[PDB]
Design an enzyme around this catalytic site. Structure first.
Site, PDB file in Angstrom:
ATOM      1  N   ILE A 222      20.132  39.555  83.326  1.00 45.03           N
ATOM      2  CA  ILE A 222      19.686  38.336  82.684  1.00 45.03           C
ATOM      3  C   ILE A 222      19.846  37.086  83.523  1.00 45.03           C
ATOM      4  CG2 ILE A 222      19.931  36.894  80.642  1.00 45.03           C
ATOM      5  CD1 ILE A 222      21.265  39.411  79.296  1.00 45.03           C
ATOM      6  N   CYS A 223      18.771  36.320  83.605  1.00 50.44           N
ATOM      7  CA  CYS A 223      18.801  35.067  84.327  1.00 50.44           C
ATOM      8  C   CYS A 223      18.939  33.980  83.270  1.00 50.44           C
ATOM      9  CB  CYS A 223      17.512  34.865  85.119  1.00 50.44           C
ATOM     10  SG  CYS A 223      17.458  33.267  85.972  1.00 50.44           S
TER      11      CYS A 223
END
Lengths: 149, 140
Positions: free
Chosen positions: A85-86
């Site tokens: 996840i960014c």
């Protein structure tokens, strides 16, 4: 001898004061390891789907941010092929009062509102910026394929 | 006594593999870039100098099971090699014959396993073994 009061605090608030649309259970062997299930946000292309996520509270936590990753394949500009996840409150903008449930609804918020414009986005990003309509349908397609069971 | 869960440990190894370590004589990466279970890995070992393995690149398959890193990964050479501890016809690494695997510790990693195999290639009992032609690989 056990966990810092804070971890016990949150861990107990979770298995007590649950976040809406989000399930969060502790691992059977690791007290700092959690198995989360996030319901696809209402009105999103993920609506109706359930997404598995794993969360780990590092030793040096709260200092260090919690580690989170999707375990269910998802078509999103800010989630890569391996579920990484960014989200910036997870790298740059992380600080001690955020806790876990700030991260969780924030992640749900990301699903509800993708950030194709993110520098380290996917490639799914490209297709989200140029042909959002098609990208949204593909996200729905992937939800049907991977997040309905 | 905090333990790092398998999936997060492998994520760490994924990052280290991409950054590379030391002199690059061993390298590793995911076999399938869409494998969220981070189970199957590709290993690479440059045969050490002054051994019959020199100037050859060995590819391996490393399998990190559900109990990794508490339990050692499974390893097999794809590139054919004559080396003690490696089944001569399948490439499978016999855990009992390779110290790092036989005496596995949860502090070990794919990197450590590959570095150990490369070190063992320098052993007196291995460095002189006649090797099969370069380029051959085992099946499966």
């Amino acid at each position: 001898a056990g966990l810092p009061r804070r971890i016990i605090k949150e861990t107990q608030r979770l298995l007590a004061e649950p976040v809406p649309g989000i399930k969060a259970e502790p691992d059977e062997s690791n007290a700092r390891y959690f198995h989360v299930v996030i319901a696809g946000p209402q009105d999103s292309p993920f609506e109706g789907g359930t997404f598995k996520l794993e969360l780990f509270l590092p030793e040096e936590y709260p200092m260090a941010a919690p580690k989170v990753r999707f375990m269910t394949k998802i078509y999103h500009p800010n989630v890569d092929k391996l579920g990484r996840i960014c989200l910036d409150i997870l790298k740059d903008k992380w600080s001690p009062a955020l806790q876990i449930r700030t991260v969780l609804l924030s992640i749900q918020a990301l699903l509800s509102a993708p950030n194709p414009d993110d520098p380290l986005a996917n490639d799914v990003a490209e297709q989200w910026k140029t042909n959002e309509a098609q990208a949204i349908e593909t996200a729905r397609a992937w939800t049907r394929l991977y997040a309905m069971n | 006594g905090v333990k790092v869960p398998r999936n997060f440990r492998l994520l760490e190894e994924l990052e280290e593999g991409q950054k590379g370590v030391g002199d690059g004589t061993v390298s590793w990466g995911l076999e399938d870039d869409e494998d969220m279970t981070l189970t199957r890995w590709t290993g690479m070992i440059i045969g050490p100098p002054r051994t019959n393995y020199e100037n050859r690149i060995y590819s391996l398959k490393v399998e990190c099971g559900p109990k990794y890193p508490e339990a050692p990964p499974s390893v097999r050479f794809v590139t054919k090699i004559n080396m003690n501890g490696i089944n001569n016809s399948s490439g499978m690494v016999d855990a009992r014959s390779i110290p790092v695997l036989a005496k596995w510790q949860n502090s070990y990693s794919i990197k450590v396993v590959l570095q150990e195999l490369r070190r063992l290639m320098m052993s007196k009992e291995n460095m002189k073994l006649p090797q099969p032609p370069e380029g051959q690989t085992y099946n499966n």
